[PDB]
Amino acid sequence: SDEEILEKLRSIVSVGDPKKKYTRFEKIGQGASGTVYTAMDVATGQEVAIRQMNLQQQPKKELIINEILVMRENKNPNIVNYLDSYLVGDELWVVMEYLAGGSLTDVVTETCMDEGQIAAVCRECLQALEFLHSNQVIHRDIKSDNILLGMDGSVKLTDFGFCAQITPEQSKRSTMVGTPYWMAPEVVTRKAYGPKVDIWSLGIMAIEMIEGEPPYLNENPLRALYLIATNGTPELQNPEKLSAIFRDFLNRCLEMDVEKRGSAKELLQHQFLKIAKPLSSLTPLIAAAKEAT
């Protein structure tokens, strides 16, 4: 109900107008969900990302409330953290950390990552996953578009618009919210899935990083879930070009048996991650992808 929605967001938001705290407004994206801007926290000089949303046209408001509540309580260095929010009438502003180096998608589509650079990205995402999973939060939409990169090679998870807070009482979910090509097979084959869906999704993202695309990208999304469900563990075009420990890591992420599939905590121990290059090694790939757009 729209009344209680507005009252609940009013309790969550900082009071007043965002232009009182943020100054250098420059539009960068268009909604859809909302007009996205960059700006500066004048006090600190931190560059920020602000989402502007007209609530009367936003279909699922329970989801923004959930997004902010979960993020606010779950701040992490490997997460693009929630900073602040403002409600002016029917107009919601959500202030976020801003990363200038684009998404992992641009890197995987414009450049060619070596295993040491892939190991670094996998480790950072897994640090974020571990933290989330230990706080009972499943992201549910792990894909390269949802990884933002700093100009310094920082790696951060974003878009928590689809996340689930589980409990010891309901530790499993059923809702099909993820992007099809990244979805774990159990999301379609059963009606009970846990945190390890993000692990599966991370494996398909490592495939993106190798091949430039998830498996079945060029299929209709409806047919992809049938293929995931019936083929199980996706095959690599050229497995022999990957080191053995990388293949092993992949097998651990894309394991069909959920119980066998590694948790984030376990995968952080994996020797594949020990070949990680310094994050700064990502900077020329970020620069080239940005240049290429």
Side-chain angles (χ1 to χ4, degrees), residues 180-181 188 215-231:
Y181 310 101
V188 84
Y216 324 120
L217 181 61
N218 307 303
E219 296 285 323
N220 195 297
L222 307 154
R223 168 154 164 91
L225 293 163
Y226 161 80
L227 289 168
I228 297 158
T230 54
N231 291 1

Side-chain angles (χ1 to χ4, degrees), residues 139-154:
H139 187 277
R140 295 203 297 190
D141 197 19
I142 299 302
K143 63 177 167 196
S144 64
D145 312 75
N146 283 339
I147 305 304
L148 301 199
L149 302 171
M151 284 309 288
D152 70 344
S154 285

Side-chain angles (χ1 to χ4, degrees), residues 11 41 78 86 92 103 105 115 139 152 169 231 239 242:
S11 67
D41 185 312
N78 294 111
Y86 299 84
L92 183 70
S103 67
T105 304
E115 290 195 12
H139 187 277
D152 70 344
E169 212 151 317
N231 291 1
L242 303 194

Side-chain angles (χ1 to χ4, degrees), residues 8-9 11-39 41-55 57-60 62-89 91-189 191-234:
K8 175 71 169 169
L9 286 158
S11 67
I12 288 163
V13 303
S14 291
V15 305
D17 183 277
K19 286 135 200 284
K20 204 150 266 274
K21 198 166 172 295
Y22 304 94
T23 33
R24 195 181 209 240
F25 274 82
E26 193 197 311
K27 180 173 176 184
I28 61 163
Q30 193 201 147
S33 181
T35 300
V36 184
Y37 294 102
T38 57
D41 185 312
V42 217
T44 57
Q46 174 175 29
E47 184 159 33
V48 296
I50 313 174
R51 287 201 273 168
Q52 174 200 28
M53 281 170 268
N54 184 16
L55 290 175
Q57 76 187 50
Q58 195 59 39
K60 282 181 188 172
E62 33 290 316
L63 301 182
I64 194 47
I65 286 159
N66 175 247
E67 195 189 323
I68 290 157
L69 300 183
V70 170
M71 296 210 290
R72 178 189 77 191
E73 297 305 327
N74 284 291
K75 274 148 171 266
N76 193 247
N78 294 111
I79 293 182
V80 184
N81 301 305
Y82 161 75
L83 292 185
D84 214 348
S85 54
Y86 299 84
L87 179 67
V88 181
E91 188 199 66
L92 183 70
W93 306 77
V94 171
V95 182
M96 302 300 286
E97 311 185 331
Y98 172 63
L99 287 174
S103 67
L104 179 58
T105 304
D106 296 321
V107 163
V108 310
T109 54
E110 302 303 332
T111 74
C112 166
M113 297 176 72
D114 65 39
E115 290 195 12
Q117 294 169 324
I118 294 157
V121 181
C122 293
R123 185 198 66 221
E124 303 294 294
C125 298
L126 275 168
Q127 285 159 194
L129 294 189
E130 220 256 69
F131 172 81
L132 285 175
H133 293 173
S134 88
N135 288 316
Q136 266 101 84
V137 173
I138 315 160
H139 187 277
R140 295 203 297 190
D141 197 19
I142 299 302
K143 63 177 167 196
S144 64
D145 312 75
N146 283 339
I147 305 304
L148 301 199
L149 302 171
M151 284 309 288
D152 70 344
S154 285
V155 174
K156 291 181 198 224
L157 189 40
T158 194
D159 200 351
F160 282 75
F162 297 106
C163 71
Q165 268 251 54
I166 58 173
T167 58
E169 212 151 317
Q170 212 211 188
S171 64
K172 273 154 171 43
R173 290 292 188 106
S174 58
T175 326
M176 302 190 69
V177 307
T179 314
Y181 310 101
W182 287 267
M183 260 180 185
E186 64 263 29
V187 185
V188 84
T189 75
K191 281 167 156 187
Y193 69 74
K196 279 182 191 185
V197 298
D198 291 334
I199 294 308
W200 180 281
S201 298
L202 168 76
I204 304 299
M205 202 175 322
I207 286 173
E208 297 188 75
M209 287 190 266
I210 297 152
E211 304 188 329
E213 289 174 19
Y216 324 120
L217 181 61
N218 307 303
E219 296 285 323
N220 195 297
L222 307 154
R223 168 154 164 91
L225 293 163
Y226 161 80
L227 289 168
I228 297 158
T230 54
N231 291 1
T233 306

Side-chain angles (χ1 to χ4, degrees), residues 65 97 192 209 240 250 259 280:
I65 286 159
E97 311 185 331
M209 287 190 266
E240 78 289 329
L250 280 160
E259 216 54 48
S280 66

